[model samples]
Target: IVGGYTCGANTVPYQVSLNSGYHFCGGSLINSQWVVSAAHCYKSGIQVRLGEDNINVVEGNEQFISASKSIVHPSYNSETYNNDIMLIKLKSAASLNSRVASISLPTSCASAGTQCLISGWGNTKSSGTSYPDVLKCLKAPILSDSSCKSASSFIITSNMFCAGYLEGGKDACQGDSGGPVVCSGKLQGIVSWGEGCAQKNKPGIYTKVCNYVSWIKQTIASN
Candidate 1:
């Protein structure tokens, strides 16, 4: 199953709401008081809604405590897509329930070729239109580290995970960044980048949560 959802106005389907303005991405709830998203998704006045299908129709099931403090990975370089991860510390703990629950982060699954699910309110097809009101998701098989590096000519560092359709057609485009990539119902990755959305031999890249265990712990503890 996929995790998290998006926030935006009904009129602007391509734009999502952040604290300052609108964004085009999604994020995941990793702990009772923290949410995991891409560093690029960080913005002031950011608010998140979880456990919903129609982002335009359904009011968020849960109102998470807002966070005045948001921290992006120290080495997150948007230009290179390295360490493209971030966390939001809520002002208070969230109420966990069946519909709203924290996703478990992968602890040790580091090898490549690990299949995972990427969910978002992004463009469904390459060069296609974005969904007007609903969120869409797809299952992408994780590519091996070597395979991904070889294919993109970009280093698939330990902090990143790769997944997508090798033959093309299905993928997470534009608005899909900062979303969750789950494997076996566990939160394994965060949507990062790829070559022009979805293309043959090009897959979506993500930030591997397992590789940031120490950083996560320290961040939460310090906060």
Candidate 2:
């Protein structure tokens, strides 16, 4: 359930449309040949659409790349949604251009309280089936561990962080899983899950990217 206003074209070149028969998830292009996403969306027969702004158009810059393999985080707990991260190895390198590029990974962990940006294309509202052909982007606030823990009441693990509006309205829902949560121009988090999109005191949750940097590096190197 990705919800937001129209995100202009090329605003986030690293943003990708993770299509698995259906456009079920969003992905962030971490490298020309690799994409990062949530492990919960792990399934076969996946392809990534890069440099795509409007899914309904046949843009010249848009590149359709097939996913060669999927590498899920070993410790990912689907039952609890902990360590919800995965890497998609592309069949070939993307041709980098203004409409296609990779996002920068964080150098250090983002502080608990910070402003972050989340964007994707899916449900505009949790209750409806209205879908947009273009990507939507919006800003949200990152929450502290205390607030996040209180909001979830013991389910959120240390590896995860929370972000969204305190009063509700701005958040990523259902189909937005595996989307990018960019903070200060860096890839800081991945859209994991939340309690009913923009609900009162129930903000969106994310898989903190900085906590798994070593794993990303090792996975890439060893693969």
Candidate 3:
């Protein structure tokens, strides 16, 4: 069953369903025809549901856009999780209401410490379990490139951006990958990876959306 958008929830807004049930994350509708999400979410038998909050209960009220084609970043590496992003071309365009609207992509990216909103249905606290039918969200401050680079012993490549609680209480979890990290009401990043879900001292990493504008545009246009 599906529920409406949960109030007082973090705004990481994409949904994916496996055999067990649906999991929520964040994503941005770039145009009447396109929706963007994380590439790693494209495991076999997964489905992307847009414009709704409750992944399990809600029905008919929200639009369910099926993905006819999924284009993962060709350079994405599953082992290291590099280039961990993807785009879904909806079989049909969705209605353009504010609650079910598309967000614009940022022309310029933000520097460190810039605040942004992340929403999803993942765990709220570190080691917390996933929520069912409820969407949660939080505000995260973008970390400085140097700060992020220094903190992550793993490669913090140019393709990635870092954001979250410095102390690390809030973040997107397993199911939240491929969602949007929105800032200034525009899409700044695509939720990619992190050290762990909501872990202290580890910031959530995202695919820098600004860097992939041309690639996204060309891919969407070709299809």
Candidate 4:
């Protein structure tokens, strides 16, 4: 995240790092056996690192688990970037503890003006390679559909929503994809796409999680 700061160890225990050898995307552990990420982050062999804060060193509290399965939304559109959510079934369920836990899904949609948190171990520089070893977090407000649409150059589908400053700064960037955007302690969004890291009038766009709650529940239940 651009214009963000390092999060304290175990501060966001639900956060997970999706890796194929390195940290590629961030995800939220929604349950002992399930993790929610972006469909774009899908890889053939994914390792989910739970209870992680810093990526450079070994944190004794970390739980490294392999993904058993990856299920991307059937209607996910690569062209329009809609329905970008995905779920990963863990090979083994994570033992919930102080340093490892799951976040609750949103019961309802977050309204415009709602303050939210966007976090990840992504690039801190908006223009160059400055990946942070520690997890970075920023505060962003939920933008109304019309406001988001007007600020964006592309369509802001119902499956997507906007967060961050329209004037720029404090936004999710590369490597932050599939990260969490929590509002009032509920997972409301997943980092999806944006024009640039923190460009003016191009706030961060995310997969609206509330819209896919039913799909997520059903997928978890059946699979």
Candidate 5:
């Protein structure tokens, strides 16, 4: 991620890593058994790792589990990247404590012009590349849907929202996809996609979680 520091365990307790065999995508633990992520990050080799800062080794509180199923939004549009959210179910419910906990989802829609937090592992810098081994985090200013549309080329559907800067700098880069965007201690968005890393007027795009609350609840209960 752009302009973020390595965070400690439990700092963002709901944050988890998805290993799709070859690469890593970030996500948030929504409940004991379900993780929220970007639909496009879906892969057959999905595995979940929790309560760890470093991805390479098993930690004292780390719990690794395989995904039982992945549920992508039915109307997800690959072209416009609309409705780009998904839920990954773990084989079993996770045991919660200080190190492992589910983040609270928003009860109401996140307001525009709010400051939110985005965290993940890899985001390529145009200067070069060196993805951090540990999780990194930074604050991003949430922009209105109108503002997002004004700056974006795509439709900027209702299922999506925008957060970033007009000036170049501070953004979630590639490989950080499907991660959580926390605002006011509630899970708000998923790091869906972006044009480039830290480019001007090209803020990060995220799948709006508020719009999917009913779908999320039903999916978790039925599956």
Candidate 6:
């Protein structure tokens, strides 16, 4: 996250790192066996590291687990970045504890004025790369549909929402995609894309997770 604060050890237990030999993206543990992330983050050999804080060191609280299955939303559009959510089933269920747990899915759509929490190991600057070793977090207010569209030239669909300051000081940056955007303690959004890291009129766009609650539940139940 750009212009964010370092998250304390095990403070964000549901946050997970998508590691392909190294941390590449962020994810949220929705349950003991399922994690939610951006569909664009999907790639072979990606493992889920739960209970993580500092990605550079082997935190004893971390649970390194392989993915048994990865399911991207069928409607996901790479070009337009719509329906950007994806799910990964753990090879084995995570052992829930103080340092590792699941976050509840949203019960309803998040409101425009709602301030949400976004956490990740993504870049800390708008220019050049500087992925953080410790997880970082930023608080941003969700933008209304019209306001969201007005802020950027890109199309804002119902499946997505925008969050951050119009003046641009904080946001989810590169490597943050597939991370959690928690609102009222619910898994409300999944970091998807943006024009740049914490740029003016370019708030971070996120996959509206509420719209996929049924799909998520059905997929998990059937599998």
What candidate 5 gets wrong by more than 4 Å, as runs, is 124-127
Q: Write the per-residue lDDT of candidate 5 for residues 124-171, one digit (tens) a residue.
A: 473478788778888888887787788777788888888988686788
Candidate 3: where are CA atoms >4 Å away?
1-21, 24-26
TM-score of each: 0.84, 0.95, 0.86, 0.98, 0.95, 0.98
Clashes of each: 3, 3, 25, 0, 0, 1
| Candidate 1: residue 58 Cα off by (Å) | 3.4
Q: How far is 40's C-alpha from truth in model 6 (Å)?
A: 0.5
Cα-based RMSD of the predictions, in order?
5.1, 1.4, 3.9, 0.8, 1.3, 0.8
Question: Candidate 1, 70: how far from true, in Å?
Answer: 0.6
**Where does candidate 4 have its weakest 10-residue lDDT segment?**
144-153
User: What's the residue-level lDDT of 35 in candidate 6?
Assistant: 97
The candidate 2 region of ten consecutive residues with least summed lDDT is: 1-10
Deviation of model 3 at 76, angstroms: 1.1
* Model 6 global lDDT (CA atoms, 0 to 1): 0.92
- Local error of candidate 2 at 20, Å? 2.1
- lDDT computed for candidate 4: 0.92
* TM-score of candidate 6 relative to the true fold: 0.98
Off by over 4 Å in 1: 1-23
Question: Model 1 clash pairs?
Answer: 19-44, 19-45, 19-46
Of 3 and 5, the candidate ahead on TM-score is 5
- Compare candidates 1 and 5 on lDDT and give the better one: 5
